[PDB]
Amino acid sequence: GAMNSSNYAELFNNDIKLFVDDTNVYRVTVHKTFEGNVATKAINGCIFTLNPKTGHLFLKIIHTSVWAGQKRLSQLAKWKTAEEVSALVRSLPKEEQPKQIIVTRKAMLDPLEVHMLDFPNIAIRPTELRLPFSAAMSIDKLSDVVMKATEPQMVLFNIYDDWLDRISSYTAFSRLTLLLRALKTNEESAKMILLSDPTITIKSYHLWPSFTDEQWITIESQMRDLILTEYGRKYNV
C-alpha cells in the first residue's frame, strides 16, 4: 500500500524501486495575447524517475513537440508519463526492472497501472510523504539539459554524485530531500548557500559542490535554518 513515515526504511533495502514524479512533465508560461485574452506557451519538461538506493536518475526530457495539436494536456501529461516509465521498464534487463514504482502524485496510479499491465508483479504505490522532487528544475545542470533539448531525450545522472562512497543511501536521500526542500522554499537563498564559497566547485560529472564531510554538516545546517527562516517569514510563527 502507501509509502509513509512508518515504512520509510524500505526505500533503502535491496528490492529495486523507482520514484516517479510527473510535476515537471507539462510546463507552461501563462501570457496575455494581443486581444487581451490569456494563452499558455509550453516549455520543455521532464519525468523525474529516481532509484533512491543507488541515486540513478532517469531524466526523460519531454520536448514541447509532444503537446502539438493535443487537447487536455494536464491529463495527457499523466498518460505520457506512464507511457515513458513503462517504455523505460521494458528497456531495462529483467534483473534491473523495479519490483515497485512509487508515484509522488495519486493521479499517476491509474495511468501507470494501465501502462504496466504487462508487469503484474511490479507494485504501483502512492506515498503519503510530501517529497520536494518538483524542485529538480532548480538543479542548474538538470534545468540546462531540459531547456536546451530540441527533441525527446533520456539523460542519466547520479543525483547523489559520489556521496555513497562516504555515506549510506538513507543519509544520501535525507541530504537530497533537505537540498530540494530548501531549493523549493527559497531557490535564491538555497543556491547562495551552495555557491557562497568559490573555492568549492561542482565537478563536470556532478550536480552538487564537492563539499568535505564537515562542510556538508555546515551546508545541511544552513539549509535547515533557511527552511525555518522561510517558515517564520510565511506564517510569522
Binding site: 495527457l76 498518460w79 491509474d110 495511468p111 497501472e113 494501465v114 501502462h115 499491465l117 504487462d118
Partner: protein, 300 residues
C-alpha cells in the same frame, strides 16, 4: 397459466414469486402458486422466519417442465424438483386448485413490471451462469460468490457472470492505453458485444439477471456485476442509439422496483453519480435520471 405446487409448508417462511411475496405459517395448509404467466422466466424465493440468513430461490421457466417445491428436513430448505410424470402432476395440481389451497400470481393487467425487469432474461442463458445441468431450474442464494470475486469457497456453487475489469489486458489494447481507459467503446462494442455476448439483447439479459439476484437475494457479487455492466456502457463514447434508449428503460424499471429502504446497500454512489452526471452518456438516461433524482436524491 402455469402452477408450482408445494408438497407442504412445514416451516414458517416468507415466499416470494417474482416481485410478489406472502408470509406462510409453520404447517399452514399452503399447496403453492397458480396463474403464473407463461412467456417469462420466474423466480420463487424463500426467507425462513427462524433465520433471515436462509435467503435463496429458483429461477425457472414453466415451458421447460412441471416444477414443484418440497421441504427437505435434512438440508433444511424448500427445494425445487421436476415431476417427469405429466398426468400425476396435472392430477396433483387439480386437487389443490379444487381445494383452493394455492395463492394466485397476483398480476394486475395494466402492470408490465415483470416483463420490463426480465425482457432480455433467457432461462437457457441463466443455466450457463448457474451451472447444474441435471436440473432445468437454477438455484441462487445470498452468499454465492462470482467467478470474479473468487479470482481475488467452491467453484460448482459460483455465479459465472462475464468478468468485466477496466484495468485488464482484455479491456485495454496495447498502444491505446489512455484512449481505451477513458473511452471504453472498444471494450463494450468489440470485446463484449461482438466478442462475448454476440448482441445487445444478451448483454441486457445478464445485466437484468445480475440486478434481480442483487435485489431478491441481496447477492453482493450480482450487485457488483449490475454496476460494472452499467458503468461499461456509460463510460463508452460510442454506443448504438437503440442500446442507450433501451438501457434508460431497463434501469428506470430497476430503480422503480427497488425497495425504498434498500437503496443504501444495493446502489453504488460512485457508479450512479458518474453514469448520470460525468460520463459520456450523462444526457442519454432521461427516465433513469428523473426517477433517481426524485426517489433517491440523497445518494446523489
Amino acid at each position: 397459466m402455469n402452477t408450482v405446487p408445494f408438497t407442504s409448508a412445514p416451516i414458517e417462511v416468507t415466499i416470494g414469486i417474482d416481485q410478489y411475496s406472502f408470509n406462510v405459517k409453520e404447517n399452514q395448509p399452503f399447496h403453492g402458486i397458480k396463474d403464473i404467466p407463461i412467456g417469462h422466466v420466474h423466480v420463487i424465493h424463500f426467507q425462513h422466519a427462524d433465520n433471515s440468513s436462509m435467503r435463496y430461490g429458483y429461477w425457472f421457466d414453466c415451458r421447460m417442465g412441471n416444477f414443484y417445491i418440497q421441504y427437505d428436513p435434512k438440508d433444511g430448505l424448500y427445494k425445487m424438483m421436476e415431476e417427469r410424470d405429466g398426468a400425476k402432476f396435472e392430477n396433483i395440481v387439480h386437487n389443490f386448485k379444487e381445494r383452493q389451497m394455492m395463492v394466485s400470481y397476483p398480476k394486475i393487467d395494466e402492470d408490465d413490471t415483470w416483463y420490463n425487469l426480465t425482457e432480455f432474461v433467457q432461462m437457457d442463458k441463466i443455466r450457463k451462469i448457474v451451472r447444474k445441468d441435471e436440473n432445468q431450474f437454477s438455484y441462487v442464494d445470498s452468499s454465492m460468490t462470482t467467478v470474479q470475486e473468487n479470482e481475488l469457497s467452491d467453484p460448482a456453487h459460483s455465479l459465472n457472470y462475464t468478468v468485466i475489469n477496466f484495468k485488464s489486458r482484455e479491456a485495454i489494447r496495447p498502444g491505446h492505453e489512455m484512449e481505451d481507459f477513458l473511452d471504453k467503446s472498444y471494450y463494450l462494442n468489440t470485446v463484449m458485444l461482438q466478442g462475448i455476448f454476440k448482441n445487445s439483447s444478451n448483454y441486457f439479459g445478464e445485466l437484468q439477471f445480475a440486478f434481480l439476484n442483487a435485489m431478491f437475494f441481496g447477492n453482493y457479487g450480482s450487485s457488483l456485476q449490475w454496476h460494472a455492466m452499467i458503468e461499461l456502457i456509460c463510460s463508452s463514447a460510442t454506443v448504438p442509439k437503440h442500446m442507450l434508449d433501451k438501457l434508460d428503460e431497463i434501469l428506470y424499471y430497476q430503480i422503480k422496483t427497488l425497495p425504498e429502504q434498500y437503496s443504501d446497500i444495493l446502489l453504488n454512489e460512485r457508479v450512479w453519480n458518474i453514469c448520470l452526471y460525468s460520463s459520456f452518456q450523462k444526457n442519454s438516461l432521461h427516465n433513469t435520471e428523473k426517477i433517481m433524482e426524485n426517489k433517491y436524491p440523497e445518494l446523489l
